[PDB]
mmCIF file of C-alpha atoms (C1' of nucleotides) and ligand atoms in Angstrom:
data_model
loop_
_atom_site.group_PDB
_atom_site.id
_atom_site.type_symbol
_atom_site.label_atom_id
_atom_site.label_comp_id
_atom_site.label_asym_id
_atom_site.label_seq_id
_atom_site.Cartn_x
_atom_site.Cartn_y
_atom_site.Cartn_z
ATOM 1 C CA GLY A 4 87.333 108.728 144.635
ATOM 2 C CA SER A 5 84.303 108.065 142.456
ATOM 3 C CA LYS A 6 84.158 108.086 138.650
ATOM 4 C CA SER A 7 81.134 109.387 136.742
ATOM 5 C CA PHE A 8 82.425 109.902 133.172
ATOM 6 C CA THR A 9 82.231 106.849 130.909
ATOM 7 C CA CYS A 10 83.439 106.193 127.370
ATOM 8 C CA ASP A 11 80.624 105.022 125.087
ATOM 9 C CA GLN A 12 83.150 102.964 123.069
ATOM 10 C CA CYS A 13 85.121 100.842 125.562
ATOM 11 C CA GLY A 14 83.355 101.626 128.849
ATOM 12 C CA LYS A 15 86.302 102.907 130.893
ATOM 13 C CA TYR A 16 85.605 105.262 133.794
ATOM 14 C CA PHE A 17 87.108 108.690 134.446
ATOM 15 C CA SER A 18 86.820 111.176 137.297
ATOM 16 C CA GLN A 19 86.940 114.308 135.110
ATOM 17 C CA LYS A 20 85.432 115.244 131.760
ATOM 18 C CA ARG A 21 88.846 116.361 130.493
ATOM 19 C CA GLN A 22 90.231 112.898 131.268
ATOM 20 C CA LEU A 23 87.492 111.301 129.160
ATOM 21 C CA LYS A 24 88.102 113.674 126.243
ATOM 22 C CA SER A 25 91.832 112.889 126.228
ATOM 23 C CA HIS A 26 91.171 109.135 126.240
ATOM 24 C CA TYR A 27 88.465 109.428 123.563
ATOM 25 C CA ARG A 28 91.207 110.300 121.052
ATOM 26 C CA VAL A 29 92.182 106.618 120.787
ATOM 27 C CA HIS A 30 88.798 105.856 119.167
ATOM 28 C CA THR A 31 88.458 108.876 116.853
ATOM 29 C CA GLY A 32 92.148 109.532 116.160
ATOM 30 C CA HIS A 33 91.743 113.281 116.693
ATOM 31 C CA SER A 34 94.860 114.990 118.097
ATOM 32 C CA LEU A 35 96.771 111.701 118.261
ATOM 33 C CA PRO A 36 100.530 111.637 117.553
ATOM 34 C CA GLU A 37 100.599 112.079 113.771
ATOM 35 C CA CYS A 38 103.553 111.173 111.563
ATOM 36 C CA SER A 39 104.970 114.053 109.534
ATOM 37 C CA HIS A 40 105.694 111.726 106.578
ATOM 38 C CA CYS A 41 102.590 109.576 105.971
ATOM 39 C CA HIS A 42 100.229 111.413 108.378
ATOM 40 C CA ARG A 43 99.139 108.200 110.081
ATOM 41 C CA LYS A 44 98.282 108.375 113.773
ATOM 42 C CA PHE A 45 99.348 106.247 116.733
ATOM 43 C CA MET A 46 98.477 105.801 120.390
ATOM 44 C CA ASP A 47 101.458 107.620 121.932
ATOM 45 C CA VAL A 48 104.638 109.372 120.829
ATOM 46 C CA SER A 49 106.800 106.308 121.505
ATOM 47 C CA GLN A 50 104.796 104.239 119.021
ATOM 48 C CA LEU A 51 105.250 107.113 116.568
ATOM 49 C CA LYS A 52 109.041 107.006 116.969
ATOM 50 C CA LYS A 53 108.993 103.266 116.248
ATOM 51 C CA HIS A 54 107.001 103.924 113.070
ATOM 52 C CA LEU A 55 109.513 106.569 111.953
ATOM 53 C CA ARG A 56 112.034 103.794 111.262
ATOM 54 C CA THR A 57 109.724 102.472 108.527
ATOM 55 C CA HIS A 58 110.517 105.606 106.493
ATOM 56 C CA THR A 59 114.229 105.895 107.339
ATOM 57 C CA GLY A 60 115.102 102.196 107.146
ATOM 58 C CA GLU A 61 116.925 102.336 110.481
ATOM 59 C CA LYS A 62 117.508 98.929 112.100
ATOM 60 C CA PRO A 63 119.172 99.602 115.475
ATOM 61 C CA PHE A 64 119.004 96.016 116.837
ATOM 62 C CA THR A 65 121.904 94.004 115.405
ATOM 63 C CA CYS A 66 122.516 90.306 116.021
ATOM 64 C CA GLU A 67 125.951 89.712 117.543
ATOM 65 C CA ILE A 68 126.109 86.207 116.010
ATOM 66 C CA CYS A 69 125.596 86.839 112.279
ATOM 67 C CA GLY A 70 125.567 90.649 112.047
ATOM 68 C CA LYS A 71 122.052 91.150 110.671
ATOM 69 C CA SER A 72 120.060 94.118 111.972
ATOM 70 C CA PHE A 73 116.360 94.386 112.779
ATOM 71 C CA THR A 74 113.834 97.171 113.272
ATOM 72 C CA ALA A 75 112.629 95.959 116.696
ATOM 73 C CA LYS A 76 114.277 94.231 119.641
ATOM 74 C CA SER A 77 111.452 91.670 119.707
ATOM 75 C CA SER A 78 112.351 90.722 116.133
ATOM 76 C CA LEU A 79 115.989 90.314 117.168
ATOM 77 C CA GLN A 80 114.927 88.206 120.160
ATOM 78 C CA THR A 81 112.933 85.939 117.837
ATOM 79 C CA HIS A 82 115.852 85.775 115.392
ATOM 80 C CA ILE A 83 118.377 84.746 118.055
ATOM 81 C CA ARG A 84 116.323 81.630 118.848
ATOM 82 C CA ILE A 85 117.103 80.450 115.302
ATOM 83 C CA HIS A 86 120.853 80.385 115.981
ATOM 84 C CA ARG A 87 120.334 78.495 119.255
ATOM 85 C CA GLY A 88 117.703 76.088 117.914
ATOM 86 C CA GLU A 89 115.282 77.264 120.612
ATOM 87 C CA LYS A 90 111.739 76.241 119.599
ATOM 88 C CA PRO A 91 109.489 76.928 122.613
ATOM 89 C CA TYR A 92 106.242 77.141 120.593
ATOM 90 C CA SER A 93 104.651 73.773 119.812
ATOM 91 C CA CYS A 94 101.345 72.730 118.271
ATOM 92 C CA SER A 95 99.270 70.917 120.895
ATOM 93 C CA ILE A 96 97.518 68.886 118.170
ATOM 94 C CA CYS A 97 100.370 67.334 116.165
ATOM 95 C CA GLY A 98 103.451 68.262 118.213
ATOM 96 C CA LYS A 99 105.230 70.347 115.569
ATOM 97 C CA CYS A 100 107.541 72.875 117.229
ATOM 98 C CA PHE A 101 108.581 76.328 116.035
ATOM 99 C CA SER A 102 111.033 79.028 117.048
ATOM 100 C CA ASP A 103 108.680 81.695 115.638
ATOM 101 C CA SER A 104 105.454 82.412 117.516
ATOM 102 C CA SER A 105 103.596 83.483 114.370
ATOM 103 C CA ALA A 106 104.702 80.359 112.496
ATOM 104 C CA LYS A 107 103.144 78.224 115.240
ATOM 105 C CA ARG A 108 99.914 80.246 115.268
ATOM 106 C CA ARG A 109 99.727 80.065 111.469
ATOM 107 C CA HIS A 110 100.308 76.295 111.490
ATOM 108 C CA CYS A 111 97.567 75.605 114.047
ATOM 109 C CA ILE A 112 94.955 77.093 111.692
ATOM 110 C CA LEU A 113 95.582 74.237 109.239
ATOM 111 C CA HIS A 114 93.987 71.803 111.710
ATOM 112 C CA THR A 115 90.678 73.664 111.277
ATOM 113 C CA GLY A 116 90.561 73.157 107.504
ATOM 114 C CA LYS A 117 89.197 76.656 106.885
ATOM 115 C CA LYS A 118 90.079 78.202 103.507
ATOM 116 C CA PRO A 119 88.458 81.662 103.491
ATOM 117 C CA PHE A 120 90.427 82.952 100.461
ATOM 118 C CA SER A 121 88.809 81.983 97.150
ATOM 119 C CA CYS A 122 90.313 82.800 93.768
ATOM 120 C CA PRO A 123 88.005 85.212 91.883
ATOM 121 C CA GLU A 124 89.040 83.662 88.539
ATOM 122 C CA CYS A 125 88.747 79.886 89.052
ATOM 123 C CA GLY A 126 87.311 79.516 92.568
ATOM 124 C CA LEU A 127 90.247 77.679 94.146
ATOM 125 C CA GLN A 128 90.194 78.136 97.924
ATOM 126 C CA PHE A 129 93.296 78.821 100.019
ATOM 127 C CA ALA A 130 93.931 78.841 103.758
ATOM 128 C CA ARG A 131 96.320 81.802 103.387
ATOM 129 C CA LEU A 132 96.081 85.045 101.439
ATOM 130 C CA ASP A 133 99.737 85.117 100.367
ATOM 131 C CA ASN A 134 99.340 81.752 98.626
ATOM 132 C CA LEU A 135 96.248 83.072 96.838
ATOM 133 C CA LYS A 136 98.182 86.166 95.743
ATOM 134 C CA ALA A 137 100.894 83.906 94.322
ATOM 135 C CA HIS A 138 98.250 81.757 92.612
ATOM 136 C CA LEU A 139 96.723 84.835 90.967
ATOM 137 C CA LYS A 140 100.115 85.620 89.423
ATOM 138 C CA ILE A 141 99.759 82.354 87.494
ATOM 139 C CA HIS A 142 96.438 83.664 86.178
ATOM 140 C CA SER A 143 98.175 86.942 85.295
ATOM 141 C CA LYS A 144 100.325 85.027 82.826
ATOM 142 C CA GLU A 145 97.427 84.765 80.344
ATOM 143 C "C1'" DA B 1 103.660 72.300 87.725
ATOM 144 C "C1'" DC B 2 102.377 74.617 91.510
ATOM 145 C "C1'" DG B 3 99.738 74.200 95.567
ATOM 146 C "C1'" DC B 4 101.297 73.681 100.176
ATOM 147 C "C1'" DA B 5 103.558 75.162 104.268
ATOM 148 C "C1'" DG B 6 107.471 76.344 106.959
ATOM 149 C "C1'" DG B 7 111.272 80.236 107.217
ATOM 150 C "C1'" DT B 8 111.965 84.814 108.138
ATOM 151 C "C1'" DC B 9 111.229 89.477 109.593
ATOM 152 C "C1'" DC B 10 108.509 93.780 109.298
ATOM 153 C "C1'" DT B 11 104.469 96.438 111.406
ATOM 154 C "C1'" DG B 12 101.684 98.153 115.074
ATOM 155 C "C1'" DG B 13 98.014 97.736 118.668
ATOM 156 C "C1'" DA B 14 97.781 96.234 123.560
ATOM 157 C "C1'" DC B 15 99.154 97.159 128.252
ATOM 158 C "C1'" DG B 16 101.788 97.229 132.269
ATOM 159 C "C1'" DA B 17 106.346 99.536 133.473
ATOM 160 C "C1'" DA B 18 109.156 103.425 133.687
ATOM 161 C "C1'" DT B 19 109.668 108.275 133.414
ATOM 162 C "C1'" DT B 20 108.278 113.134 133.764
ATOM 163 C "C1'" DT C 1 99.907 111.128 142.190
ATOM 164 C "C1'" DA C 2 98.554 111.919 137.477
ATOM 165 C "C1'" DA C 3 99.896 112.155 132.868
ATOM 166 C "C1'" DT C 4 103.065 110.990 129.523
ATOM 167 C "C1'" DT C 5 106.432 108.127 127.597
ATOM 168 C "C1'" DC C 6 108.630 103.729 127.211
ATOM 169 C "C1'" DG C 7 109.499 98.710 126.794
ATOM 170 C "C1'" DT C 8 107.637 94.628 125.689
ATOM 171 C "C1'" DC C 9 104.616 91.122 124.181
ATOM 172 C "C1'" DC C 10 102.023 89.405 120.711
ATOM 173 C "C1'" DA C 11 98.912 89.176 116.798
ATOM 174 C "C1'" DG C 12 98.935 89.556 111.784
ATOM 175 C "C1'" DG C 13 100.588 89.705 108.315
ATOM 176 C "C1'" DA C 14 104.274 90.045 103.394
ATOM 177 C "C1'" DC C 15 107.983 88.099 101.020
ATOM 178 C "C1'" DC C 16 110.866 84.097 100.402
ATOM 179 C "C1'" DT C 17 111.751 79.288 99.892
ATOM 180 C "C1'" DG C 18 111.875 74.159 99.026
ATOM 181 C "C1'" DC C 19 109.181 70.029 99.015
ATOM 182 C "C1'" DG C 20 105.822 66.458 97.078
HETATM 183 ZN ZN1 ZN D 1 87.206 104.392 125.306
HETATM 184 ZN ZN1 ZN D 2 104.736 107.674 108.741
HETATM 185 ZN ZN1 ZN D 3 121.834 86.413 113.717
HETATM 186 ZN ZN1 ZN D 4 99.836 70.899 114.302
HETATM 187 ZN ZN1 ZN D 5 92.486 80.707 90.297
#
DNA sequence: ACGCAGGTCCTGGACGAATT
DNA sequence: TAATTCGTCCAGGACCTGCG
């Protein structure tokens, strides 16, 4: 049960050359499941079917509390915690709690003080790109 | 004013689970 | 069993919003 074929990208082992060639598609994209609309590629056909809803607008996960629908069950699961006031994610530095996992991760970056987004017009630095994009709209109004 | 930051939800890669 | 397909988590955003 040895394995002699290795991937020069991630280092995973395979017992047959054909097994290595099939796995190597995740690094080059060749022969991956390709969307017929935008021609983007994904890891397997199930991830492709999830992406298909981005073109059709289908939201098959509806909240039974307010009636709003979502594209993914994970998004619905996160949304339901809003109705119940469930905030399991907390910042270990200041104690601020969030129901959204990304809101907590985004908040914790503020304790580092890093502002890697600098305005190309005036040089004002921002910790988030979306706030810089909104700031540049003020510049757009000449 | 408008920078700041939390609210909200869409998007997709990661990865074990379930199916074929 | 091996390969494919699926479910799920989770990271990374974009758009919206009100506060100081
Ligand atoms: Zn590899
Ligand atoms: Zn597509
Ligand atoms: Zn709801
Ligand atoms: Zn904090
Ligand atoms: Zn500027």
